[PDB]
Amino acid sequence: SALFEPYTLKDVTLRNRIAIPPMCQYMAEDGMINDWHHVHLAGLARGGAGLLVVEATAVAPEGRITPGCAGIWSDAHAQAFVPVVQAIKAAGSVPGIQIAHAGRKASANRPWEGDDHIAADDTRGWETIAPSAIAFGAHLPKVPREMTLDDIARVKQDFVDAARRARDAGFEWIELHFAHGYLGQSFFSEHSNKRTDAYGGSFDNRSRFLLETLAAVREVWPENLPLTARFGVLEYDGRDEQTLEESIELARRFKAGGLDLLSVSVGFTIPDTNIPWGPAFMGPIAERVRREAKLPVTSAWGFGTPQLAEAALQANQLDLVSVGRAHLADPHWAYFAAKELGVEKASWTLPAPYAHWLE
Template sequence: MPTLFTPFTLKDVTLRNRIAASPMCQYQAQDGFLNDWHHTHYAMLARGGVGLLVVEATAVSPEGRITPGDAGLWSDAHIDGFADVATVIKQAGAVPGIQLGHAGRKAGCTPPWQGGAPLERNDPQAWEPVAPSALPFIPGDAYVPREMTQEDIQQICENFASAARRAVDAGFKWLELHFAHGFLAQSFLSSHTNMRTDEYGGSLENRARFLLETVAAVKKVWPENLPLTVRLGVVEFDASPEHSFSESLQVIRWLKAAGVDFVDVGLALSTPSEQVPWAPNFMVPYAERVRRETGLPVATSWMITRATDADAFIQDGKLDVVFFARTLLTHPHWPFLAARELNVSQPETVLPMPYAYWLQNSAG
């Protein structure tokens, strides 16, 4: 059996294979509430044969949304919609995961297909973003976020914990905290975006404090037997990427000591000037180093599209799980295609029988 199709166990959760659906924002929610779009979307991905399906970035507070269409878990009223999605994922044989986040200074924008720019201040859906420091994402932009007080910081830590408790109630078995992509946690961590002079700024230990306090708050409500994971932007592709990566390795060691079980190795994207070296599999070497130097199991994504590559990364001990995003949107049944490519003896076992029968037996 190719390693891509072997089970992966973390704590009391076992994935049927090492293929995971990465959280992909849909921007189709209304006031944070999921709807038929989400139910259909996640049912489609789960029935395609993935082992883990992580629901899109879900805001822990209204002002933490990237756009007005973001999913949210800041209210108990949101739980039922997420419970329906978690159920349909489980019924298809996948493990339901969820990513909780706060967009920080990148909040309050239009969807990317509408430009992704900050909402006009007079837009009735607009709100004031918050951030560690009053620095806009685009230098010179008049839309400046409000610098957070220490009371704000503690409130958002509590918001993460409350949302995690609701995720448990909704039936999710895998939790990912979104500490990447230039969102709130990443902007605390980055020296490019954190200019604070209190205990949340300056030294690496101070810049990592918000992340560690968030993990501590979440651990109080998240079951000990279920995976608590993070997506961390481990490298800033600026003039000194190795420096930011070295800092990230230390932060991951602290996160491990705080109780994090797994790292989804991602991009920082702290500033618009980063020069990301886009290429197939380009984040795998960083993920391998995180695995080797911290001892935590890892995943990554970012332009991994070939089943043979994904299988080799696991077999060679570079990754434990592989996240796929656009690949699965293009081919929701990609795990079946991967099983054929890797010569799995019974590729039809990857799919529900109503799909498997016709795909394996149809001459047309």
Template sequence: MVFRVRPFFFSVALPKVTINEKGICIVPNLFDPYTLKGVTLRNRIAASPMCQYMASAGLVSDWHLPHYTALARGGAGLVVVEATAVSPEGRITPGDLGLWSDEHLPGLASIVGAISKAGAVPGIQLGHAGRKAGCLPPWEGGAPLPADHAKAWEPIAPSALPFMPEQPHVPRAMTIAEIRRVQQDFAAAAQRAAQAGFQWLELHFAHGFLAQNFLSTHSNQRDDAYGGSLVNRARFLVETVAAVRRVWPTALPLTMRLGVVEFDGRDDETLAEAIQVLKWLKAEGVDLVDVGIGFSTPGAVPWSPNMLVPLAARIRAETGLAVTTSWLITDARQADSFVRDRQVDLVMLARPLLANPHWPYAAARELAIDRPASVLPTPYAFWLQGWSGA
């Protein structure tokens, strides 16, 4: 069975164009450079943050360096390191990377060096899993760690509501003091990310994790300044972005991933709320949004190719933010058209790059880009450039 996303009806302005000094209309393509703030990517292909769950105590392991080196060598313009916890209780699993301590800096700095040396811009995603924290990795079932497990911990969230109804993995409702502490954890982790050399920061405010917990009525039933109205439910996000913006270098992009749809029967309302929240966050200094899914309930998602691109286009048109998205974008020609039509500024790829880190090279050949092997490092490009043999 093929699922289709229920359509959203809206009008989008015609693509904006750039006119060069000779009066020629310039339309961007997938392999054009992209500049945001003081950072320029070599193309519009980005490696989306993909959890590996291979860390111990949040520390980089032998797995991570070759993984991120391969993604960068493959030709992506931006490589974003997986969701990295801002505090120990914010980990999805015990195998998450962390940045709550200076002890995490050397390993992450080595990843920054490898990505940069391969020609990509190093980015990192910072997050807190909220009520979804403390689980097994997905290949072990993804269920919450049993309470008597040696590595188990109590999750925290805006309200004491489990993700799965009747589930014993119930989070503790956060006090105001804990809210302040987690916001400072985000700011401190952002400072460390800059110290490690990352040039692109993404805050993970999607996937049913802590920030999305505050925004969603599925997980937030507070009756104080952090619950109830949209202004209140967005307060944690707005304050956290403001705290991070104060410490993150102004010349570097501050971005976020936000779940803008839940597929819970309230899609139009949820999207409209997300657009308003993004306007507030833009005012606090967010430069780009990675358009994602809320995942605040265990309900089914109607998966289909390129499913979030129309929503990204609407958000771009209505907020003025730069946008990107992922989710079942696999075809090079389609990805190129999304950039050319100004529906997105970048294309995020996840599973396609796991299957083939050299997807950018294959895309360049398919799109007949001049010298397609130039996206690869010299020891690969030399042998592939102009070669038509086996």
């Protein structure tokens, strides 16, 4: 089966095409992860997936989405990942991490504690920053502080320092979080970037933040380790053909700048959208990005059944299939998939103490 063929990219070889995408757990304290993350991630890696991408991890404290988000803005934070990365590799999966900055969507409650912007009288809240002082709206009404050129310079540096630490902690795959309406996405989008300087206005200008961050990170991230990014290529906002054409052009520019693979997603930059959720609904968009940008890709948001995952790969809509919620429901989803698709000795997708009994 396609789903269980290995995948090599640079010096990294994943044992199958299943990737667990970054999924915030909101269980960290002041950016520090703890035994929640440790057991959660080592458990997922033992489950059989070829690649495990750690949740959005903030490059700087105001760049967390919530008070529960992970951070890697100091060496102490990075060191905390070391036992988890080792546990993931010992399980045979490839450890990756997504480094992030929530931009205007930051300073927010955990999704089960309101999901909304933290109240002004609430003591956990903080100032958010963004390309322009414009609120997302809806449940996220805080107006962000407008970034100056100096802020842009500092945040770029935090990304570089984050990538350096990720590298030293032993990650073998990095993902820049340029999606989901966070800082990078907000720089690209005209809905949120009304700047009149080198960073807003034209296409070149809106791409600039993202391209400069990619390039500053690329100087410190090893040439032989996959260097990837997540990016929301459309919004379902009524401007989809123009937005998609522009996003695919940015993807060609990421490729020109050494990006190795693109995780294709939705922008979620603004709330007034009409996203057509459904099984593998992202398949044709990812297929387009892949074919026109000529870059490997993955996507998510509906591929979490073994047959859908297998079809997307067979049709070359994706190179890796990212399966999120199914892995929360069942940490051994890879084994479930292998049994469904009639893989030989499917149970040895797991470690011997499980695989032996499940034959």
